[PDB]
Short mmCIF file of C-alpha atoms and ligand atoms in Angstrom, two decimals:
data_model
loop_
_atom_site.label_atom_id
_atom_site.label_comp_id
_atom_site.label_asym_id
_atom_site.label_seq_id
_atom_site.Cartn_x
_atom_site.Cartn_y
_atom_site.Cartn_z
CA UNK A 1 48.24 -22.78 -68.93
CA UNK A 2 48.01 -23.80 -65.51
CA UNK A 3 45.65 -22.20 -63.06
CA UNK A 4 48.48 -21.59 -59.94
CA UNK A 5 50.33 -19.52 -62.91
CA UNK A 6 47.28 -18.18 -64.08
CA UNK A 7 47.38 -16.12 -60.90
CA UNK A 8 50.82 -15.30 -60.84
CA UNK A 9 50.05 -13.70 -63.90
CA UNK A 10 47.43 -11.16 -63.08
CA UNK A 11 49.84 -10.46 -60.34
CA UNK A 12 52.57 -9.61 -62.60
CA UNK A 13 50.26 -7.82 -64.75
CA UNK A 14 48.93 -6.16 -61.16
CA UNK A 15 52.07 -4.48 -59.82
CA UNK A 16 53.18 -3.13 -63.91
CA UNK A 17 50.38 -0.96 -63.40
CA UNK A 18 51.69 1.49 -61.34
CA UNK A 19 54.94 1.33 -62.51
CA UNK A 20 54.04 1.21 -66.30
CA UNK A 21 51.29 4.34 -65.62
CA UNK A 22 54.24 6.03 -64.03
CA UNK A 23 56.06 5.82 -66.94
CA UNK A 24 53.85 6.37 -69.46
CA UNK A 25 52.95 9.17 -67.93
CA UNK A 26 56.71 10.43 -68.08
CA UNK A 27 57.01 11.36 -64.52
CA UNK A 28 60.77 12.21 -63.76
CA UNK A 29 62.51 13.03 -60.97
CA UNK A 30 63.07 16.13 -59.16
CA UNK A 31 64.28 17.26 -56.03
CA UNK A 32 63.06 18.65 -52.88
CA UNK A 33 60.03 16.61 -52.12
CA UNK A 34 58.48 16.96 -48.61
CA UNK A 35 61.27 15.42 -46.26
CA UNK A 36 58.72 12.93 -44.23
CA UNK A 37 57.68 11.21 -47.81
CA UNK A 38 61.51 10.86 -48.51
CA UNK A 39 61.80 9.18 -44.92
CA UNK A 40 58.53 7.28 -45.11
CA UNK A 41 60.09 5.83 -48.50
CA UNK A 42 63.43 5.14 -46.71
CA UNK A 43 61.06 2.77 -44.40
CA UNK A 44 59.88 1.39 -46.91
CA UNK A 45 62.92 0.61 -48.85
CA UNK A 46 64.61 -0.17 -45.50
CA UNK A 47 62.02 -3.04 -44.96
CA UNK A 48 64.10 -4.45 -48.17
CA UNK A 49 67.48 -3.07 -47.14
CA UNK A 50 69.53 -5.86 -45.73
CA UNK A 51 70.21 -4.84 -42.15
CA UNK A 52 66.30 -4.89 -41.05
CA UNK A 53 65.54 -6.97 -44.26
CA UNK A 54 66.44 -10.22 -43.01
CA UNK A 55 63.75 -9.79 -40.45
CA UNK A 56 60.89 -9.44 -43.18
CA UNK A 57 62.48 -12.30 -45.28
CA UNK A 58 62.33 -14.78 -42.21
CA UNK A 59 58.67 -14.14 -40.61
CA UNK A 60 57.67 -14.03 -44.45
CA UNK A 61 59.23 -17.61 -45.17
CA UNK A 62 57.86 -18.52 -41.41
CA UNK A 63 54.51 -17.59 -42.34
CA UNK A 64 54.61 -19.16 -45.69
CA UNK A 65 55.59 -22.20 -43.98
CA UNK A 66 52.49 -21.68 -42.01
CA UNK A 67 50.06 -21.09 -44.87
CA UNK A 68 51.59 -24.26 -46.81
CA UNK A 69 51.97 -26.59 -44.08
CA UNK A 70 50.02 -29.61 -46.15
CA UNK A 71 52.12 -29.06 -48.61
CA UNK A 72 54.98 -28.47 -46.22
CA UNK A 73 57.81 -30.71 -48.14
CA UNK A 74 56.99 -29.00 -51.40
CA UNK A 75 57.48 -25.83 -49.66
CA UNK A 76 60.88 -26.54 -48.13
CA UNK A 77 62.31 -27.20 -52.15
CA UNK A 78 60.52 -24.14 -52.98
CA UNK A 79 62.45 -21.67 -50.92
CA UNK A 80 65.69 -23.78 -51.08
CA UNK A 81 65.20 -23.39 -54.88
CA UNK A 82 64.79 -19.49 -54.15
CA UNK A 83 67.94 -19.37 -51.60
CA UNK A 84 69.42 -20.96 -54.92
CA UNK A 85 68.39 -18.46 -57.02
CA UNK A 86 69.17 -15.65 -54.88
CA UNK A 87 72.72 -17.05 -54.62
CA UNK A 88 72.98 -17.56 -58.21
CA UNK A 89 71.81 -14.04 -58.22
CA UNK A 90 74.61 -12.87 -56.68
CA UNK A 91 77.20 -14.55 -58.61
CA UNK A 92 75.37 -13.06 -61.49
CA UNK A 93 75.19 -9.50 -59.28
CA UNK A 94 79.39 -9.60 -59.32
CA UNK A 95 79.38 -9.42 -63.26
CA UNK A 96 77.34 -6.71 -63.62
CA UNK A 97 79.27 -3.92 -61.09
CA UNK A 98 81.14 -2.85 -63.96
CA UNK A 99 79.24 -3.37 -66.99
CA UNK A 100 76.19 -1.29 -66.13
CA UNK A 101 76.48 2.74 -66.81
CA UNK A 102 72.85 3.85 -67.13
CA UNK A 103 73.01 6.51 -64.46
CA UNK A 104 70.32 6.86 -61.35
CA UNK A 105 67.77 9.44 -61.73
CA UNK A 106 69.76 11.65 -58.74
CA UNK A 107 72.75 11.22 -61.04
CA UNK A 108 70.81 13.43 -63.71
CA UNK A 109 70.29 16.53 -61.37
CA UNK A 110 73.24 16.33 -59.45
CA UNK A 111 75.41 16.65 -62.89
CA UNK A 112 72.97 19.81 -63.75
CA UNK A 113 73.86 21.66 -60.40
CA UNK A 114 77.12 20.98 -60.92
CA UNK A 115 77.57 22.41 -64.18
CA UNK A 116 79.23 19.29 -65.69
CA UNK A 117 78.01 18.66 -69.19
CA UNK A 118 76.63 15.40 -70.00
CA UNK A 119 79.16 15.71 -73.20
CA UNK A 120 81.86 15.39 -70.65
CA UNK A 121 80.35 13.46 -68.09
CA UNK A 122 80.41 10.30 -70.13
CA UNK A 123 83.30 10.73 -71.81
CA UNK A 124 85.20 9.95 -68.67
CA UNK A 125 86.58 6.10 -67.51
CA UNK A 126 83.83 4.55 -66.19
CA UNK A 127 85.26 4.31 -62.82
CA UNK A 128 86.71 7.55 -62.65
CA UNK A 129 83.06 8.41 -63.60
CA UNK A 130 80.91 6.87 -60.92
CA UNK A 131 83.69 7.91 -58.12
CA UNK A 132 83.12 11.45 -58.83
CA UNK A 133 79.23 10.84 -58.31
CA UNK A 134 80.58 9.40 -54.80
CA UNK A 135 82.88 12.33 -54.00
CA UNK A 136 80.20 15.11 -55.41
CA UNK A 137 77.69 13.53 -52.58
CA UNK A 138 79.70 14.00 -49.59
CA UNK A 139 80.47 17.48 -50.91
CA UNK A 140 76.76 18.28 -51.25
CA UNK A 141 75.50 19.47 -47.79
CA UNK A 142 71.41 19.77 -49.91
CA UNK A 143 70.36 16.57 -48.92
CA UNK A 144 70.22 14.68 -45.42
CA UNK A 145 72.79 12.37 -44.23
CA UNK A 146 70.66 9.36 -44.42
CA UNK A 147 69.70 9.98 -48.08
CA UNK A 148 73.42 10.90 -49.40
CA UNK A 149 74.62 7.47 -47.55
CA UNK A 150 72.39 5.25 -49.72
CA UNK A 151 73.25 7.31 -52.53
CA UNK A 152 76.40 6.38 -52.07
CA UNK A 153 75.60 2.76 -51.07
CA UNK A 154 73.67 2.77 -54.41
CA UNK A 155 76.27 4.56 -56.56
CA UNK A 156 73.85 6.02 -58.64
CA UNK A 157 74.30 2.84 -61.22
CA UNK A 158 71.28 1.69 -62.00
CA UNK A 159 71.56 -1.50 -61.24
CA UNK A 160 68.61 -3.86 -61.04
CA UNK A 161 66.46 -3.36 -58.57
CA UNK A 162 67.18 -6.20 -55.98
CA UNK A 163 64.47 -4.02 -53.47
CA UNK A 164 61.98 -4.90 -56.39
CA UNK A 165 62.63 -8.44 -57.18
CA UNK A 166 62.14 -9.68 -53.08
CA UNK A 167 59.50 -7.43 -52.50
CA UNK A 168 57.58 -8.36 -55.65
CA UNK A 169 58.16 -11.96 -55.37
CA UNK A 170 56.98 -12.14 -52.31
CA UNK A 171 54.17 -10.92 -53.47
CA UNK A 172 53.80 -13.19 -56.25
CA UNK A 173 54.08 -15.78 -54.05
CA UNK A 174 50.99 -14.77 -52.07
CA UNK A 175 48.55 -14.27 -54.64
CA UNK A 176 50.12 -17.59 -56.45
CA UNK A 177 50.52 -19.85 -53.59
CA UNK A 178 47.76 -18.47 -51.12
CA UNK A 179 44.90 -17.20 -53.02
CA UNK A 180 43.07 -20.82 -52.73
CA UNK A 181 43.89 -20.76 -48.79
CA UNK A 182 41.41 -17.71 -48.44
CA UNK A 183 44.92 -15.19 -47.40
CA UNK A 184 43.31 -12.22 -48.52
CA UNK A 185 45.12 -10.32 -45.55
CA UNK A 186 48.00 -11.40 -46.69
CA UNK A 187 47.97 -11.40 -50.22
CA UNK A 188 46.64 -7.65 -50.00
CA UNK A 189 49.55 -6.91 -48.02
CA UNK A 190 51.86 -7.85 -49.90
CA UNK A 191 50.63 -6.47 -53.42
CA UNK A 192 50.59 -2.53 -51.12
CA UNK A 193 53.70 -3.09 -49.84
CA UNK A 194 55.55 -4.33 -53.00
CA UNK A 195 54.12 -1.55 -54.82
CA UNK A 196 55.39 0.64 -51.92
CA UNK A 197 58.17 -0.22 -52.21
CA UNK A 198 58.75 0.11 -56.21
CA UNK A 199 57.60 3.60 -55.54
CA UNK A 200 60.00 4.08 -52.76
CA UNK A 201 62.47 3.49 -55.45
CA UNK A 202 61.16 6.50 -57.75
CA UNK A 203 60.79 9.00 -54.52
CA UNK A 204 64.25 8.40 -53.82
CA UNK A 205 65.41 9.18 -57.46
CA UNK A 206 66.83 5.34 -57.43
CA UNK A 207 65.43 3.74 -60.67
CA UNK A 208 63.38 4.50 -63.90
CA UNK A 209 59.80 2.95 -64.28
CA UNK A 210 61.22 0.58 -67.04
CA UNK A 211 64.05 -0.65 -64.20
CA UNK A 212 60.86 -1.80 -62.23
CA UNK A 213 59.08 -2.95 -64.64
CA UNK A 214 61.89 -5.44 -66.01
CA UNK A 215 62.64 -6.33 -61.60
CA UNK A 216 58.49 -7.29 -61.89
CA UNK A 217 58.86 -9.48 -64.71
CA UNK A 218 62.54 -11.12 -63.68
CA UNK A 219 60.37 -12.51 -60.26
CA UNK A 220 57.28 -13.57 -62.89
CA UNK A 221 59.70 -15.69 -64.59
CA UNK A 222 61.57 -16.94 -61.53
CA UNK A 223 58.75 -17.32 -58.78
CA UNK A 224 56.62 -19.68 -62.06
CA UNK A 225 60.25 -21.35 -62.77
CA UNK A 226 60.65 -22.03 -59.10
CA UNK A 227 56.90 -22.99 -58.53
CA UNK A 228 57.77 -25.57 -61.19
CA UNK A 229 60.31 -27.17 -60.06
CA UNK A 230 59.12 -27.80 -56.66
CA UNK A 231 56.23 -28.90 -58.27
CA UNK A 232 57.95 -31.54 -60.90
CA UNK A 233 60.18 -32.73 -58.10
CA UNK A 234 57.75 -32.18 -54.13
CA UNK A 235 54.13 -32.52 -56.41
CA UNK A 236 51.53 -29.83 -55.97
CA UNK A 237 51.76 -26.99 -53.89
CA UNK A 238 47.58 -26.65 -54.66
CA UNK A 239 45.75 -27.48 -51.28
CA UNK A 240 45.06 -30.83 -51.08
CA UNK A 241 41.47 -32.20 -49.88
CA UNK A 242 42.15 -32.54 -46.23
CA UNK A 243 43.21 -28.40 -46.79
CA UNK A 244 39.36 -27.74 -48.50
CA UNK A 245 37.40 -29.68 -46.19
CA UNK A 246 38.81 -27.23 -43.18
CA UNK A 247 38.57 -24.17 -45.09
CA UNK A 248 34.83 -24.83 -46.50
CA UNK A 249 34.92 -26.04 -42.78
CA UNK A 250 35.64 -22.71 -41.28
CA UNK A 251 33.47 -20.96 -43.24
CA UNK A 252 30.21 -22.43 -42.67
CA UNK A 253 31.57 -22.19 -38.65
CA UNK A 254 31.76 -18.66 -38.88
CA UNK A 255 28.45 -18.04 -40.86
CA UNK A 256 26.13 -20.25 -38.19
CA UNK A 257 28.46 -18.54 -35.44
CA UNK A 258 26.20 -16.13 -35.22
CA UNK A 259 23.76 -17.95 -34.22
C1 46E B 1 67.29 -23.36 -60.23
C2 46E B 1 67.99 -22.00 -60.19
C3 46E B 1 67.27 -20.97 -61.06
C4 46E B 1 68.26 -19.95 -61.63
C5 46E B 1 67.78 -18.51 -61.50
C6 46E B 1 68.92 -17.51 -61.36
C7 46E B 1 68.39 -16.17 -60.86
C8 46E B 1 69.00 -14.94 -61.54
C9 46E B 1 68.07 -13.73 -61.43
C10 46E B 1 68.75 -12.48 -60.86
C11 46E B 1 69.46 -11.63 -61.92
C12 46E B 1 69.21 -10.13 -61.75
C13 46E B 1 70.48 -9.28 -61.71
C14 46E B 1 70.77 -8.73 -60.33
O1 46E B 1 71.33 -7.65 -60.20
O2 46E B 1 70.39 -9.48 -59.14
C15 46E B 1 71.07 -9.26 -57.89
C16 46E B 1 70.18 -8.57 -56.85
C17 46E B 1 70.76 -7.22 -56.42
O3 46E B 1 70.73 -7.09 -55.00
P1 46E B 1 71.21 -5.70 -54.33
O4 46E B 1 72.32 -6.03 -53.35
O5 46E B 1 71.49 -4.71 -55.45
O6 46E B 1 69.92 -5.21 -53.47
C18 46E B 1 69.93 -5.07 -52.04
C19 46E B 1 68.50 -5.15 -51.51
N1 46E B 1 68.00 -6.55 -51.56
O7 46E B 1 70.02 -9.40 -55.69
C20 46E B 1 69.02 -10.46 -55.82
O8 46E B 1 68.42 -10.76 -54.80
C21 46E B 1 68.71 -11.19 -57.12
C22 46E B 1 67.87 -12.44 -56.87
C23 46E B 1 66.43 -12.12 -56.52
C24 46E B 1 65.64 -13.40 -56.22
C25 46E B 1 64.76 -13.29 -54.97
C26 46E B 1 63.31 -13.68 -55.22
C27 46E B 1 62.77 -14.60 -54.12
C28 46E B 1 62.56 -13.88 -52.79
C29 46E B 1 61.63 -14.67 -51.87
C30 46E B 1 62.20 -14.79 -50.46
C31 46E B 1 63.41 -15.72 -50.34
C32 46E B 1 63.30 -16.61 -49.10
C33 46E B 1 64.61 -17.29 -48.70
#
């Protein structure tokens, strides 16, 4: 198959390490983990979250821009192909907000402490259900304010991981798009930071491994399906030879800079 999907690829295959490990390994949840790592994940997942995530999404995009100026056209359908998708992804996200019952890891504990059977538990409306997750949080005083809110926000549905799908897309994008263009920086960046924030997910008691596993390989499929496209209809996104001829440029400048 082609070489720019190629790299995708070992991406993909890349960030389901960790997460795959993780659940091999049959790590589960608990509580009461060292309160800075529970913020420092918050961060994390806040660099997603969409009050300060817009920020992240828009110098990414800018930079991308940057990186795949020669191909600058192609890059413009790219992203409006992703705005599409993300849109389409939420029509598709409206479906879902009462289909899904797979609970949150949080949702597991929480049910222990509060005696409440798991018999009983799901033989309840699933409304009536997931409500009494939302009232049982602001009764709980355990956990910190900041925490219990995105609990809430969450509802302890696991729902797919929209945190994983940007994060890891992005970083799909990097090593796909970028590796030719020398962005090691970047691409490195990215991959830690995705990862990050899949973890984030796990500290928080969020999602299951499998959740981010199946969020890694949704943005495989869509960043290579998106790729495509722009690449059928803008031609390649691969650096063209007046993009070499600078880079093999720039590094024979900075070799005979030292002398
Ligand atoms: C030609 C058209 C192709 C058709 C493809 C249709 C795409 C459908 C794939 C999505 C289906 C997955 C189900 C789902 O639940 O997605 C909705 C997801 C949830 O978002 P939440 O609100 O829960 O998360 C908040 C934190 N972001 O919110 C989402 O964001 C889902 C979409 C994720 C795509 C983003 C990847 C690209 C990101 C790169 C940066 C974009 C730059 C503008």
């Amino acid at each position: 198959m082609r070489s720019i999907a190629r790299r995708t690829a070992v991406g993909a295959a890349l960030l389901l390490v960790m997460p795959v490990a993780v659940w091999i390994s049959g790590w589960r949840w608990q509580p009461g983990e060292q309160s800075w790592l529970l913020k420092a994940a918050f961060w994390v997942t806040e660099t997603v979250t969409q009050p300060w995530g817009v920020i992240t999404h828009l110098i990414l995009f800018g930079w991308f821009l940057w990186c795949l100026r020669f191909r600058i056209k192609a890059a413009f359908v790219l992203f409006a192909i992703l705005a599409a998708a993300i849109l389409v992804g939420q029509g598709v996200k409206s479906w879902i907000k009462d289909k899904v019952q797979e609970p949150r890891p949080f949702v597991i504990w929480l049910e222990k402490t509060h005696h409440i059977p798991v018999d009983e538990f799901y033989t309840l409306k699933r409304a009536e259900r997931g409500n009494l997750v939302k009232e049982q949080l602001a009764e709980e005083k355990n956990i910190p304010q900041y925490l219990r809110s995105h609990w809430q926000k969450e509802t302890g549905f696991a729902f797919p991981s929209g945190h994983t799908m940007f994060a890891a897309s992005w970083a799909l994008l990097a090593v796909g798009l970028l590796w030719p263009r020398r962005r090691t920086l970047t691409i490195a960046i990215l991959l830690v930071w995705a990862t990050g924030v899949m973890g984030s997910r796990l500290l928080l008691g969020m999602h299951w491994p499998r959740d981010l596993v199946v969020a890694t390989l949704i943005s495989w499929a869509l960043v290579a399906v998106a790729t495509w496209l722009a690449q059928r209809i803008c031609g390649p996104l691969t650096p063209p030879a007046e993009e070499n001829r600078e880079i093999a440029q720039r590094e024979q400048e900075s070799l005979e800079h030292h002398h």
